[PDB]
Design a protein around this motif. Structure first.
Motif, PDB file in Angstrom:
ATOM      1  N   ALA A 166      23.839  14.410  58.682  1.00  0.00           N
ATOM      2  CA  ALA A 166      24.449  14.483  57.247  1.00  0.00           C
ATOM      3  C   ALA A 166      24.486  16.175  56.838  1.00  0.00           C
ATOM      4  O   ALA A 166      25.508  16.086  56.226  1.00  0.00           O
ATOM      5  N   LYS A 167      23.739  16.980  57.448  1.00  0.00           N
ATOM      6  CA  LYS A 167      23.895  18.279  57.249  1.00  0.00           C
ATOM      7  C   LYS A 167      25.108  18.881  57.912  1.00  0.00           C
ATOM      8  O   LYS A 167      26.066  19.559  57.286  1.00  0.00           O
ATOM      9  N   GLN A 208      28.021  17.590  56.049  1.00  0.00           N
ATOM     10  CA  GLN A 208      28.222  18.408  55.135  1.00  0.00           C
ATOM     11  C   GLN A 208      29.008  19.603  55.154  1.00  0.00           C
ATOM     12  O   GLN A 208      30.003  20.069  54.437  1.00  0.00           O
ATOM     13  N   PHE A 219      32.698  19.052  56.027  1.00  0.00           N
ATOM     14  CA  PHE A 219      33.440  18.614  54.633  1.00  0.00           C
ATOM     15  C   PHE A 219      33.996  19.994  53.756  1.00  0.00           C
ATOM     16  O   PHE A 219      34.945  19.985  53.515  1.00  0.00           O
ATOM     17  N   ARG A 220      32.968  20.902  53.946  1.00  0.00           N
ATOM     18  CA  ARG A 220      33.283  22.162  53.098  1.00  0.00           C
ATOM     19  C   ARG A 220      34.407  22.661  53.960  1.00  0.00           C
ATOM     20  O   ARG A 220      35.291  23.396  53.306  1.00  0.00           O
ATOM     21  N   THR A 224      34.185  14.727  60.637  1.00  0.00           N
ATOM     22  CA  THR A 224      33.033  14.787  59.409  1.00  0.00           C
ATOM     23  C   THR A 224      32.293  13.330  59.711  1.00  0.00           C
ATOM     24  O   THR A 224      30.994  13.277  59.211  1.00  0.00           O
TER      25      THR A 224
END
Ligand code: ADP
Lengths: 465, 461
Positions: free
Chosen positions: B61-62, B65, B68-69, B111
């Motif tokens: 999940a990191k 993350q 996604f950015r 992602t």
């Protein structure tokens, strides 16, 4: 039982030309003769398979599944007859031979359900008057080259799946036990398989070179020894073929200092002498190695050109500075349990595989060194680590490159193989887990976009004669 | 100005060998690029090798993350990027923006890769024996990218490889390396740890460095066919995984019944400079009638909108007996008729707007022609006959097929080896091939053998 025939184009052919003899390992006496085939006799098979392909490719998935399902029944019907033919030319316990065929049948059972996972999608008007679809198609005519051990299962691991996917197959099995393989081929024809879809051509380096050269054959599948595997891989791939290749290797166990010795010894004794293939025990530190030897030695006493082959192997070992701790040569000329210590990867006894109960201990100073040792060679299909440390085990599982790993436990991997290239298949994994890799090797994805450009009117004048 | 490397999270200035990047619309050198030595590469390799263990254990999940950015920061800086593409590659800003939109689709797919990478756990599969199955990253991997697409081809490689938990060394094209490096930096700005992505500029030296380095476990290349064959064979020879797309020629087939305006429309879309635009360089015509007719229509429309290399190409064509119907020497726009597979103009791949007509007598011959060479990634057939189309779709070996319709495959590539990836397919369809290239499957079985007692004497200090 006099001469064994080829199975080209649905009929049994008798070849007379070059010929070798199939012996009976448990008797010594040659029982039958085998035809080493010419390029012409192979081109027959290739043409037969090339001809059968378009009809077979368009056979409905459910009909292909149907013929496979009967093939499974006709094997479960004739088991006794087959197993006998395995033990006779290979020489192995009928119980082992029956267990092999049970595996082959699991492969056939998996192939019957391959048509289901192969259906694709359709979409009307993905664009204005433009349909789109995707399919998984067979690749064409494919060939499989099979080894001496497993004349039943290794072919049944290749061709049923390839045929279920809609290809046609040329099988060139081992010269040394080819009768059992051919029987199973015939039973497939008896189950309903069209002529030319499966062909069996006996031969040797000539026969194989024929298949490697033939531009009609699109994929090549091999299991055997590492030199022959590298050959077929490189020479096949350089001619645009898909090549799947398993070559003989050595599986390694690692012993950490904290290993529960009775547990490791139990695995090693089952694997090397007593089910898993292990031929090298990498010990981290001298303490655990000295201790392992102390326990192994008692338990190993507890249990013509090939005579010169093993003596040569052992003798080289001593010559290059290994410590021969238990020499298994003896009477009843058998080779019992042999143990080598202080072995290094530059020695011939590490590089060359030898048939029979031989373990080599390699002493190393760190886990990193042990993992690097295993990873830097033609790594096998199974490996173990023995330790009580959680961090060690996690690291080993993360950084080792072997596909199956056992932590304080042996794995059901009875022969060691290295896998070449990117078309990788597992021989001993769960069929449902590694089957898709087989399916992908024998298929090609196709993506169609279609439009029928319109006319303003459809009067008879707009069509032909 | 001078363009910097991006090793270990910081921008390095190299001065040593150097080439010049030109502004290829307006052929005049705008910047200098550092051709790196083995030491400058070993820096990157060591940086990536160092970053790997931490990154490998970063939670799914990191990783999702930070990707996604990265997607957001690209959709933020589009104008700035696209400018940098059109400036050094030379192409309509509209095309350059469409390229980046594709790159972003690649980042969006990456992602969600952590989700499809979860495996099974089973307690007591045997007596006190647990079993599980996992998809692990392979280690440090490298990607070597071409001149066309400095945005999308890297974003098709490293985001997916990093999402899977590897670390990446990217060696982009010397000829337009500014735009690629900007996008690398934005990834660091999004939160990526130092060393996980490194950019090292260079040439054959730099590439040979990566091919030689035993730490790099996989090698990914898209460019020309000779360089692809090189990297494939020499890489596989050293135990590496190699994914290689090499330049090729896509073929269109015209049957006699083809709707000519429809075929001409598809062929004429296939443009070269200095959603379904296609690369086609050969039109195989079945029968002479349709060929004569095709030529009649093509000639007027060929008023469209390395130079020294391809005078030789065209000249050889004439020499070996091809009919040069429109000569583009000057803007290009060249048409050859009566081309055969024995000619050099068929065998050698050519810069620019060049179309070759090959006359053939049957569909079988056309299909055999296409299949028997290093076949591309797209092909069309133009016909009204249903049986012809079905047969073509069945027996042609090209992966994407268009029946009276062109395909969204703007460059032709042949794929080598068994690690095969499609560049222009549906990401959701061909993404798993990427995932499998950047991961290794593991099956673990585990037991902790028991003790009879657990007094302090049984443990270590
Ligand atoms: N030198 C060779 N070149 C090509 N193929 C070979 C060669 N030797 C054996 N073969 C073929 O490959 C298989 C045997 O390979 P090998 O590695 O010798 O397996 P095994 O020894 O375990 O039977 C047989 O099917 C045989 O036809």
């Amino acid at each position: 039982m006099t001469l064994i025939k080829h199975l080209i184009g649905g009929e049994l052919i008798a070849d007379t030309g070059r010929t070798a003899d199939v012996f009976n390992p448990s008797t010594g006496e040659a029982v039958r003769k085998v035809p080493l085939a010419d390029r012409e006799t192979m081109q027959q098979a290739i043409d037969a398979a090339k001809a059968a392909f378009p009809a077979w490719r368009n056979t409905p998935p459910a009909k292909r599944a149907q013929v496979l399902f009967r093939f499974k029944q006709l094997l479960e019907a004739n088991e006794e007859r087959i197993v006998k033919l395995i033990s006779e030319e290979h020489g192995k316990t009928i119980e082992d031979a029956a267990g092999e065929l049970k595996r082959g049948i699991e492969n056939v059972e998996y192939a019957t359900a391959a048509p289901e996972i192969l259906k694709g999608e359709y979409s009307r008007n993905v664009g204005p008057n433009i349909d789109a679809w995707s399919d998984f198609q067979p690749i064409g005519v494919v060939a499989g080259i099979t080894p001496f051990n497993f004349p039943a299962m290794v072919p049944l691991w290749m061709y049923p799946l390839a045929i279920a996917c809609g290809n046609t197959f040329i099988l060139k099995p081992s010269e040394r036990d080819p009768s059992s393989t051919l029987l199973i081929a015939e039973l497939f024809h008896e189950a309903g398989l069209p002529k030319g879809v499966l062909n069996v051509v006996h031969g040797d380096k000539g026969a194989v070179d024929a298949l490697i050269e033939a531009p009609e054959v699109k994929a090549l599948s091999f299991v055997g020894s590492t030199p022959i595997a590298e050959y077929i891989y490189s020479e096949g791939t350089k001619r645009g073929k898909r090549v799947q290749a398993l070559g003989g290797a050595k599986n390694h166990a690692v012993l950490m200092p904290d290993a529960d010795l009775d547990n490791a010894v139990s695995a090693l004794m089952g694997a090397a002498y007593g089910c898993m293939a292990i031929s090298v025990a990498v010990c981290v530190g001298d303490q655990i190695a000295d201790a392992l030897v102390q326990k192994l030695v008692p338990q190993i006493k507890g249990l013509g050109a090939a005579r010169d082959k093993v003596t040569g192997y052992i003798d080289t070992g001593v010559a290059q500075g290994a410590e021969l701790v238990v020499d298994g040569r003896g009477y009843k000329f058998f080779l019992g349990g042999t143990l080598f210590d202080r072995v290094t990867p530059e020695m011939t006894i590490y590089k060359e595989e030898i048939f029979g109960p031989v373990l080599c201990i390699v002493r190393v100073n760190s886990l990193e060194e042990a993992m690097q040792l295993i990873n830097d060679h033609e790594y096998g299909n199974g490996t173990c680590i023995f330790t009580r440390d959680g961090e060690a085990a996690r690291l080993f599982c993360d950084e080792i490159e072997v596909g199956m790993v056992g932590v304080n436990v042996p794995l059901p991997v009875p022969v060691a193989y290295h896998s070449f290239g990117g078309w990788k298949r597992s021989l001993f994994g769960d069929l449902h887990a590694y089957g898709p890799d087989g399916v992908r090797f024998y298929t090609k994805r196709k993506a169609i976009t279609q439009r029928w450009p319109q006319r303003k009117s459809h009067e008879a004048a707009q069509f032909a004669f």
